[PDB]
């Protein structure tokens, strides 16, 4: 269980039917090219909490929850360098719905690679305990 300050790039929601971490990265690269997602997030920071329950993203004053990504519904999360030349680290989360009929992609940008990796480690430990 841990909290991190992150920025929010955006989401591609309600996709139907990306098996492979490389495929997800490529999918998002192309989505950015096609204007579905920004390349660079707005500067506004959010609080990302990671735990056994999943990932929660809240405003920086904790007054409002933006996203709740429950562990049950997380399919995979990929951490990667955005490739834009500044070494920024992204987290791309693939999630599904209660019936596992639709998928959504959520993309965040971390302050540092150390933090992105820390986030992944908590998530991986979370799955381990199941």
């Amino acid at each position: 269980c841990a909290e991190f300050r992150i920025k929010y790039v955006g989401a591609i929601e309600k996709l139907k039917l990306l098996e492979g971490p490389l495929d997800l990265i490529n999918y998002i690269d192309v989505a950015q090219q096609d204007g579905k997602l920004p390349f660079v997030p707005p500067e506004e920071e959010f609080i990302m909490g990671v735990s056994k329950y999943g990932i929660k993203v809240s405003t920086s004053d904790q007054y409002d929850v933006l996203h709740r990504h429950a562990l049950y519904l997380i399919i995979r999360m990929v951490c990667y360098d955005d490739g834009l030349g500044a070494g920024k680290s992204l987290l791309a989360l693939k999630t599904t719905d209660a019936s596992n009929e639709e998928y959504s992609l959520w993309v965040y940008q971390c302050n540092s690679l150390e933090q992105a990796q820390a986030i992944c480690k908590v998530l991986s430990t979370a799955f381990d305990s199941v």
Partner: peptide, 19 residues
């Protein structure tokens, strides 16, 4: 444009429930 995904990937985490 940007380098290949292989050159950029750091780690991935998979939910075994859907694997």
């Amino acid at each position: 444009f940007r380098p290949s995904p292989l050159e950029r990937i750091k780690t991935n985490v998979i939910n075994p429930a859907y694997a």
